[PDB]
């Protein structure tokens, strides 16, 4: 009783391999699954309020260095000093600034103006940008309440409101200056339940936060996550301090990798992105902007100073990032260098990039730096750069670099196949994937590196245009409704599908108190009606009564159009006619089509009954009930 | 030729279980390994050092 095994062993142990190969796949997917980007938002100096604005600004090689702000309460005359070495002075007067830093909408978030006054500007900017980023992703923020999504933010203290505080404004000073409240306020107003951590790691904070978020998504702690950074200056102390170090260029413009680089220039901004696991993003039907593959972070270590960099650490972090991403040094095509513009950092960074990337290259790679266009955004720098690269993948065009005449002579440019980017280039799809790299090295010593890849190709689906479609727009205030209507009218002036925008507006958007709807059949009529819209109502619901009238509301050919376009009404009319068929000698459907006589009252009264019943049925269909 | 196939199949596909069970243990230890403490230091009020 031991010979009946030959077939059973094979049948049993085929399942062994088939089943336990899945575990081997799962270990790889848990160690190195790619992350998907499903939404971005940002604002930067130069009037930028959306990623499209940033792409437009970059594509036409326009800088945005401006004058000092005068509305923040600074003392311009005493601070500004062309003399380099006068006590308590700065020898620069340029830079990038957000002239709308103080603007905020307190009523939208249910915050009294007295609270808003004591609130730090970074909290307000983070709130607004987070809401904008969530709206961009096409996910309803209201329905997002109660889930387990997480937030990660990068910011540093600035000493806002460090002077005397009046008792009237006293009450929310402590809660409006702290750092944990930056994520606490978002998790409070949105009702989230995932981890909320704020990380301060000098100028490389934001990417580090992103890195942390990725790890959480791999651990299963959270399903949704959003990461970003923010920086706005409240006091000019940094300007004076770095002026005493003679590290700021007199012009205030950062000439990255140029032969005439002599300093840097500070700036401000804020950026936020939303991250997802690739499989979950495919399952939920979102759209993929780009894919983050791998990342790494380490420390400068023992160097020639507390602030001096080290090339070996940068080389090591680049190799670690490439190994984690599972790629090769010859696969990337463009790297967004740090490009701070110092007389020391640029040669070291160029030498490191030559050492690691500029080897065995069949085709030379390119590099650029957004800092030449905007400046040093500090904690909000890296995220901004990331956004730029994403746009470069979507528009299939290499952006140019500004403020370059000759490459710096402190390095040997012949050591590798790497060359600067001074003119726009075409970056089309060619079968092989397109990849990019992002770098950021902080003052404290930490360094980061990120690898981005184009979104997977997808096929489009053709749809037929509907004859007549509604357009519903909702907001929280009347002025916001007017702004929404104006923006929609501006959008519809282009070449877009009315059905597409109507479906997106009805499905990918929230619902609020103030409401306004229009009906359209063509784009021109739609925009005309939207511009002419002046009526809206914030009514309060009560109880609904369905009044059924008497007689005198008849005309031959009532439902011939409705039977021809409304399926539920047509089916109800047909079913009612079939029910009434045995005890009648006509066809009610043909009677209402235009083949009936009003004289036959035995057809008249049932006609009114049937049209009333069908009108009730179609009302039920839309989702309202008596 | 192929008559002694039972022994071949058994010894071929025993290795699959033997090693892929180790793979399963590897994923379990990757997602749930304990972390040990080897050193501490503290300074608290009351003369504690």
């Amino acid at each position, epitope marked *: *009783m031991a010979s*009946t095994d030959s077939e059973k062993v094979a049948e049993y142990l085929r399942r062994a391999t088939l089943d336990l190969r899945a575990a081997r796949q799962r270990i790889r997917e848990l160690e190195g699954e790619p992350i998907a980007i499903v939404g971005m938002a940002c604002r930067l100096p130069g009037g930028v309020a959306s990623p499209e604005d940033l792409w437009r600004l970059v594509a036409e090689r326009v800088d945005a260095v401006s004058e000092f702000p005068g509305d923040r309460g600074w003392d311009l005359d005493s601070l500004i000093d062309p003399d380099r070495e006068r006590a308590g002075t700065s020898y620069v007067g340029q830079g990038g600034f957000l002239h709308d830093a103080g603007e905020f909408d307190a009523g939208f978030f249910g915050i009294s103006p007295r609270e808003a006054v004591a609130m730090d500007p970074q909290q307000r900017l983070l709130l607004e940008t987070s809401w904008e980023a969530l709206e961009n992703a096409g996910v309803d923020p209201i329905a997002l309440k109660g889930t387990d999504t997480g937030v990660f933010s990068g910011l540093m203290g600035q000493g806002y409101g460090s002077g005397a505080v009046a008792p009237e404004l006293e009450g929310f000073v402590t809660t409006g200056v702290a750092s944990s409240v930056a994520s606490g306020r978002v998790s409070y107003v949105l009702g989230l339940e995932g981890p909320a951590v704020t990380v301060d790691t000098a100028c490389s904070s934001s990417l580090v936060a992103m890195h942390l978020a990725a790890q959480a998504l791999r651990q299963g702690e959270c399903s949704m996550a959003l990461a970003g950074g923010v920086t706005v200056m409240a006091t000019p102390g940094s300007f004076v301090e770095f002026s005493r170090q003679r590290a700021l260029a007199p012009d205030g413009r950062c000439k990255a990798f140029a032969a005439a680089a002599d300093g840097t220039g500070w700036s401000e901004g804020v950026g936020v992105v939303v991250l997802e696991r690739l499989s979950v993003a495919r399952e939920r039907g979102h759209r993929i902007l780009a894919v983050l593959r791998g990342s790494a972070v380490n420390q400068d270590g023992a160097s020639n100073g507390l602030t001096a960099p080290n090339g070996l650490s940068q080389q090591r972090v680049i190799r670690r990032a490439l190994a984690a991403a599972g790629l090769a040094p010859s696969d990337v095509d463009v790297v967004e260098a740090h490009g701070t513009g110092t007389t020391l950092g640029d040669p070291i960074e160029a030498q490191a990039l030559l050492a690691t990337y500029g080897q065995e290259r069949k085709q030379p790679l390119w590099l650029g730096s957004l800092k030449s266009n905007i400046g040093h955004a500090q904690a909000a720098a890296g995220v901004a750069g990331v956004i730029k690269m994403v746009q470069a993948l979507r528009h299939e065009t290499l952006p140019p670099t500004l403020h370059v005449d000759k490459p710096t002579l402190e390095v040997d440019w012949s050591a590798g196949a790497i060359e600067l980017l001074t003119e726009a280039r075409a970056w089309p799809r060619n079968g092989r994937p397109r990849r990019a790299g992002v770098s950021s090295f902080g003052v404290s010593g930490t360094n980061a590196h990120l690898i981005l890849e184009e979104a997977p190709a997808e096929e489009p689906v053709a749809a037929p245009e509907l004859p007549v479609v509604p357009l519903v727009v909702s907001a929280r205030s009347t002025e916001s409704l007017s702004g929404q209507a104006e923006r929609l009218a501006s959008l519809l002036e282009g070449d877009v599908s009315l059905t597409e925008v109507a479906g997106a507006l009805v499905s990918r958007r929230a619902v609020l108190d103030e409401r306004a709807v229009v009906v359209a059949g063509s784009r021109e009529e739609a925009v005309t009606g939207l511009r002419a819209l002046n009526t809206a109502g914030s009514g309060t619901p009560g109880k609904v009564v369905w009044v059924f009238p008497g007689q005198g509301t008849q005309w031959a050919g009532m439902g011939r159009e409705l039977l021809a376009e409304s399926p539920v009404f047509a089916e109800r009319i047909a079913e009612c006619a079939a029910a009434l068929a045995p005890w009648i000698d006509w066809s009610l459907v043909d009677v209402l089509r235009g083949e009936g006589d009003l004289g036959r009252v035995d057809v008249l009264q049932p006609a009114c009954f049937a049209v009333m019943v069908g009108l009730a049925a179609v009302w039920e269909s839309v989702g309202v009930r008596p | 030729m192929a008559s002694t196939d039972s022994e071949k199949v058994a010894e071929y596909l025993r290795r699959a279980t033997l090693d892929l069970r180790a793979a399963r243990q590897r994923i379990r230890e990757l997602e749930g390994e304990p972390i040990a403490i080897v050193g501490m230091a503290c300074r608290l009020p009351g003369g504690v050092a």
Partner: antibody
Amino acid sequence: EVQLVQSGGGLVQPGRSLRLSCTASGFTFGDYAMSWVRQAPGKGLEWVGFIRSKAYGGTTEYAASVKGRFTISRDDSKSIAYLQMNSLKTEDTAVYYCTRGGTLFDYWGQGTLVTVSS
Amino acid sequence: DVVMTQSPLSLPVTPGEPASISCRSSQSLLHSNGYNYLDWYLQKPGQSPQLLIYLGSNRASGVPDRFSGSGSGTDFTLKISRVEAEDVGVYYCMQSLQTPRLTFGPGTKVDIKR
């Protein structure tokens, strides 16, 4: 992705015949064996029959209690398993499942209810 | 010479605690090649059956990792580290040394302790 769908149920009168079909997809159907099992209402499970694969002769085996009345056929070209209910009785009213594999019951279908009552 | 296997009829279980089910036999199932021939099947109410464990101490895919099996010779044991609400059903300990298998046996019921 490994999947299989059962069909061919309903209510039948004693005396005549019926057939049950199972369509498989997502894997190489020409290799695995297919078996049929049945569960009576408010009872357990007991094996009904199975059919071997082509590589092992493509033979069949049926339960002793109901032997000599049922036939199981396979269509590797269309990857469909057919069971032929013949001369049903009142005791045959039950829920039938089709399962991949002869000895190791790996994957199971959605089942199909068959009622025989005069 | 037909091997007969028996298990406790019913065992109420409180969620959050480990549970164990034993399965004996009338003859050792160990073979010359060195494999025990035992399988564990789970049948949820109003659902099709499902495979849990084959060859004594091997767990199939899809099954949550909290299940485990052990034993040898004539005695085997299924152990679950923590019981949830979805684990209510029927469990069957079915041999494979002797073929064909006429029936799956009476099995064991699982419910909520009260």
